[PDB]
Amino acid sequence: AYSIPKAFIMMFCNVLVISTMTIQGKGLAKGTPHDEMVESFGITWLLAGTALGHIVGAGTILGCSTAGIL
Template sequence: MLTVTPRAFEWTPTVGIIMILCNVVAIAFAKYTMKNPSAEPQIPAGNLFGGFGLPAILASTSFGHVLGAGVILGLSNIGVL
């Protein structure tokens, strides 16, 4: 057990770009699948996010981060990153 150590992974701009792309994909997915994306409370610049309310932004970006973490870990494990 002591010889099994997780691979240390450093942040690079590529990792940041992958996370941003995963969040954009998650927001686009949410735009077309959410029943009520403009639920209250509204955010100040809601038109920048397609008219999403705060619950929709939190839900879609949370999903985007989970998706991004999976993609980054997967690409790291297969040796692409």
């Protein structure tokens, strides 16, 4: 990573994905507590969340770079 805007966008996308994701009907946005998510899914909750966060972060960063917004 190079740019502070890129880091901010990636961090925001990762946090948004982790907050709004749902596995088997459980998610933080759906009012499941952090401790229950941690016990039910373990680090699979972070790994998948950050993987899709990186995918959407790459998509938005590349789109913004193409559009000149960044």
